[PDB]
Amino acid sequence: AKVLCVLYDDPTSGYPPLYARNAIPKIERYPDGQTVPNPKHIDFVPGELLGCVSGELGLRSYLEDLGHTFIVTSDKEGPNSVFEKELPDADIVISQPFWPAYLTAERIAKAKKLKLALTAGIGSDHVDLNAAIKAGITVAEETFSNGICVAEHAVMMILALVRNYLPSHKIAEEGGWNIADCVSRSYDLEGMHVGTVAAGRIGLAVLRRLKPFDVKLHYTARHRSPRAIEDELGLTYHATAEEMAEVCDVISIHAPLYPATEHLFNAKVLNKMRHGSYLVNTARAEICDRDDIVRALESGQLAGYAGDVWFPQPAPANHPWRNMPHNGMTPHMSGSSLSGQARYAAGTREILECWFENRPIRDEYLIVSNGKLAGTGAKSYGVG
Amino acid sequence: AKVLCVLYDDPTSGYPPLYARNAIPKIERYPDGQTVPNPKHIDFVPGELLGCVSGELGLRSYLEDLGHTFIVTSDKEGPNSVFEKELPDADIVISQPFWPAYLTAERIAKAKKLKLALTAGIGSDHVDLNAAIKAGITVAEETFSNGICVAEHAVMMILALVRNYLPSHKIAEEGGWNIADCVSRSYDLEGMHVGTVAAGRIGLAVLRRLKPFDVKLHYTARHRSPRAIEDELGLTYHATAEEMAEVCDVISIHAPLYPATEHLFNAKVLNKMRHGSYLVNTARAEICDRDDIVRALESGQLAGYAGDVWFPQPAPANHPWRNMPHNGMTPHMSGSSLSGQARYAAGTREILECWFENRPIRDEYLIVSNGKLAGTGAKSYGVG
Numbered sequence: 161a162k163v164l165c166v167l168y169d170d171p172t173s174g175y176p177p178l179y180a181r182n183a184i185p186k187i188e189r190y191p192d193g194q195t196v197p198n199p200k201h202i203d204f205v206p207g208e209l210l211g212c213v214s215g216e217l218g219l220r221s222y223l224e225d226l227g228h229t230f231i232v233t234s235d236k237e238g239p240n241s242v243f244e245k246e247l248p249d250a251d252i253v254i255s256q257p258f259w260p261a262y263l264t265a266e267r268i269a270k271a272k273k274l275k276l277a278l279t280a281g282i283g284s285d286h287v288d289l290n291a292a293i294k295a296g297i298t299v300a301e302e303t304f305s306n307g308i309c310v311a312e313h314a315v316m317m318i319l320a321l322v323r324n325y326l327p328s329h330k331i332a333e334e335g336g337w338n339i340a341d342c343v344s345r346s347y348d349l350e351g352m353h354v355g356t357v358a359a360g361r362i363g364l365a366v367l368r369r370l371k372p373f374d375v376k377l378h379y380t381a382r383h384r385s386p387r388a389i390e391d392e393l394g395l396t397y398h399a400t401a402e403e404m405a406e407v408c409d410v411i412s413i414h415a416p417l418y419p420a421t422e423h424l425f426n427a428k429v430l431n432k433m434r435h436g437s438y439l440v441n442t443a444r445a446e447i448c449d450r451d452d453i454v455r456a457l458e459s460g461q462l463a464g465y466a467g468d469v470w471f472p473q474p475a476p477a478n479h480p481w482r483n484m485p486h487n488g489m490t491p492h493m494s495g496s497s498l499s500g501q502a503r504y505a506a507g508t509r510e511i512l513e514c515w516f517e518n519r520p521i522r523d524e525y526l527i528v529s530n531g532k533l534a535g536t537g538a539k540s541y542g543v544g
Numbered sequence: 545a546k547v548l549c550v551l552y553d554d555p556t557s558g559y560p561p562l563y564a565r566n567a568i569p570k571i572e573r574y575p576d577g578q579t580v581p582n583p584k585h586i587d588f589v590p591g592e593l594l595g596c597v598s599g600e601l602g603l604r605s606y607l608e609d610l611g612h613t614f615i616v617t618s619d620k621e622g623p624n625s626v627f628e629k630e631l632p633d634a635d636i637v638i639s640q641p642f643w644p645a646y647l648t649a650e651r652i653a654k655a656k657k658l659k660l661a662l663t664a665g666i667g668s669d670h671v672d673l674n675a676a677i678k679a680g681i682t683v684a685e686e687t688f689s690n691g692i693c694v695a696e697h698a699v700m701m702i703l704a705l706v707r708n709y710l711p712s713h714k715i716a717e718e719g720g721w722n723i724a725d726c727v728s729r730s731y732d733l734e735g736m737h738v739g740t741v742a743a744g745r746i747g748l749a750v751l752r753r754l755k756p757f758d759v760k761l762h763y764t765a766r767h768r769s770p771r772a773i774e775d776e777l778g779l780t781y782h783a784t785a786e787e788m789a790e791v792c793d794v795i796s797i798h799a800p801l802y803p804a805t806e807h808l809f810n811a812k813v814l815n816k817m818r819h820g821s822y823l824v825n826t827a828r829a830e831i832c833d834r835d836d837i838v839r840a841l842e843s844g845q846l847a848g849y850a851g852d853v854w855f856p857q858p859a860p861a862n863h864p865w866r867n868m869p870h871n872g873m874t875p876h877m878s879g880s881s882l883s884g885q886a887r888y889a890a891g892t893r894e895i896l897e898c899w900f901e902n903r904p905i906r907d908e909y910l911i912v913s914n915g916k917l918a919g920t921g922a923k924s925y926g927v928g
């Protein structure tokens with residue numbers, strides 16, 4: 161088989177980078193009991209940089225020893241990219257959400273041999289799932305592989321926004337003291353109403369991390385969480401995001417992107433919030449309406465917005481979220497911490513081993529299979 | 545009586561600032577059961593900026609209606625400062641740790657009428673406690689008033705360091721994407737060993753907030769915390785900071801500053817940590833050796849350092865912690881969030897009401913009274 165893999169560019173300093181530490185913690189299970197990936201072997205040491213061109217997700221020897229071909233590129237934009245030129249006879253396409261090889265309907269039509277579209281990470285919205293369904297392409301991802309990474313990043317961003325961290329760090333760097341300037345917009349999180357959009361793998365992890373901050377917890381979802389979970393965490397459920405927006409000081413988004421969630425957080429929802437509320441989005445950019453977010457920050461309707469996800473990706477240098485007021489943005493990085501990479505790279509290999517050996521891809525990894533949403537896709541996504 | 549009060553300068557934009565929101569949560573009790581301050585009245589709305597010269601800690605009408613004089617200034621350096629010129633006949637001196645009026649032995653000797661040295665905030669190490677004891681001065685502070693603020697700030701800083709937030713935000717602002725550069729130093733906190741120096745009011749609040757991040761928790765203190773606490777959090781105790789340093793990936797400092805803790809975190813302790821460890825210090829700067837911290841970051845012995853506390857305060861523009869590598873500093877702000885200010889300003893008034901009415905200052909607020917460490921001072925401090 162021909163495996164076409166799109167990864168981000170190597171570090172500016174070169175590859176490998178100068179690692180700050182030489183080992184990372186051992187993780188064996190996720191909080192819900194799901195096991196971490198179980199490939200027969202891995203050809204990297206956890207903690208290495210794997211998601212760039214030279215890192216290769218640690219796949220080359222595995223693939224070539226089996227007689228497969230493995231093409232790795234970062235060049236992914238337009239019909240003259242290495243990606244699009246190599247696509248027509250690729251059996252398998254792999255890319256990460258952080259540097260995504262978009263599989264539009266038009267590209268899927270060109271992809272005459274494509275049978276497996278594998279996300280290295282979580283979130284397969286860069287693939288047109290309706291087109292994949294029609295074409296009989298399997299779409300899979302490494303469920304839970306980097307979810308805890310995201311939960312950490314989201315809580316970090318909530319705190320940075322509410323406490324006014326980023327402008328205050330700039331004052332320290334630039335020689336100032338200026339306590340009044342630092343604290344004129346600095347609040348505690350304690351006692352605020354905080355809600356998540358979704359209480360799935362990441363949303364629940366966020367709610368759990370928020371609990372000891374002594375906030376009042378809310379969530380919205382299409383299907384109510386078990387009473388035991390609501391009791392554990394003191395959750396208040398809302399049938400819709402609009403209703404939750406009315407009562408929350410801070411919202412963090414943790415749903416997948418598909419038609420029902422596209423532009424869910426637009427002006428109508430944002431304007432339901434109290435003036436000076438906060439929004440964090442480490443889910444997908446297009447769950448928000450891009451320009452409505454800018455307007456909310458310009459008016460102070462939102463006191464702050466932060467996230468790691470943008471549209472499109474990579475975000476152009478002129479993207480309006482970069483320098484809108486009161487933002488805590490990063491590039492799309494949370495799911496690509498070195499710790500997360502070890503897990504999604506291992507899971508990418510696990511999935512390939514199953515595929516090549518004619519064994520099932522784990523149900524929880526599936527998004528589309530056999531011409532329909534399947535596994536986690538059927539539980540978390542829609543195509544209507 | 546004459547009340548001499550040193551506060552920081554007003555916001556650069558003017559006073560009042562443009563508030564992002566017009567109310568904050570109501571807090572009634574601290575996690576150990578201590579009640580929030582109970583002054584007869586407050587002359588501000590919680591959420592207002594109180595800690596600058598124009599804010600006056602909300603004390604002016606209260607004091608002047610009683611016939612007291614109230615002098616508020618930010619001018620605190622040298623013998624010609626308004627502070628030192630007004631000091632010789634001040635009965636009461638008030639200042640905040642964020643902009644501290646240092647009560648050296650020499651200043652205390654000049655302060656012929658001084659009877660009460662009141663910290664607006666927590667941490668009275670800017671007062672020479674031996675000199676206060678000798679002079680028969682009462683030293684008091686608003687215990688717990690801003691401790692939760694600090695705990696939030698510390699956890700925020702831990703996450704920002706481990707995940708490489710600050711340099712990544714810069715890339716977003718400056719038009720880059722550069723995922724490899726962002727994540728080459730980005731780790732998850734999950735599974736790391738994290739320790740606190742002290743498990744007091746703030747240390748315990750930090751440990752509780754860390755728990756759901758699924759880290760392995762450690763602490764050091766002069767005596768063992770209660771069974772319930774060690775069991776609740778799965779704590780491992782170490783008799784010394786050096787011992788804890790050997791096994792922790794991250795340490796956060798939460799002890800008071802006095803001779804036993806001065807320069808505790810010097811090269812001897814830093815070098816016990818594994819290469820690439822992280823240190824957060826929202827306690828007091830001088831618990832660390834200033835230049836040893838710099839050198840540990842320059843060599844990579846520490847992968848990161850962050851805190852809000854400096855020495856001296858204000859830190860000069862050329863202070864080496866501002867632009868040392870891999871830092872997440874802010875000016876001294878955590879205890880002066882608008883939320884914390886509401887509580888310490890209310891407590892400052894409560895203490896003054898007790899004082900003027902010949903009623904006890906709460907035992908838990910006392911640091912020095914009647915010529916010895918007293919109250920919380922006796923439980924948490926030493927005088928060497």
Ligand SMILES: NC(=O)C1=CN([C@@H]2O[C@H](COP(=O)(O)OP(=O)(O)OC[C@H]3O[C@@H](n4cnc5c(N)ncnc54)[C@H](OP(=O)(O)O)[C@@H]3O)[C@@H](O)[C@H]2O)C=CC1
Pocket residue numbers: 281282283284304306307310357358359360361362363380381382383384414415416417420421442443444468469492493494495496536539540541
């Ligand atoms: N920033 C990054 O690096 C990363 C981002 N992500 C993003 O986060 C998303 C969530 O990941 P994860 O928690 O692991 O996924 P899960 O599938 O576990 O959870 C998603 C939840 O979303 C809820 N949901 C679906 N539709 C809606 C709707 N219309 N409104 C509200 N809630 C909805 C579902 O609950 P219900 O059925 O009750 O509605 C489901 O439980 C991913 O799909 C991805 O886009 C993920 C990893 C990394």
Ligand SMILES: NC(=O)C1=CN([C@@H]2O[C@H](COP(=O)(O)OP(=O)(O)OC[C@H]3O[C@@H](n4cnc5c(N)ncnc54)[C@H](OP(=O)(O)O)[C@@H]3O)[C@@H](O)[C@H]2O)C=CC1
Pocket residue numbers: 665666667668688690691694741742743744745746747764765766767768798799800801804805826827828852853876877878879880920923924925
């Ligand atoms: N950044 C900011 O804005 C703020 C900073 N702070 C700083 O944080 C400090 C802690 O505040 P808080 O938790 O409220 O104070 P507490 O008095 O509640 O706790 C201090 C703890 O320090 C421990 N301790 C004392 N001496 C030592 C030692 N030699 N080694 C190790 N532990 C020691 C004590 O435990 P044991 O007796 O078992 O040793 C005590 O429980 C303050 O004193 C202040 O300097 C406070 C507020 C705001």
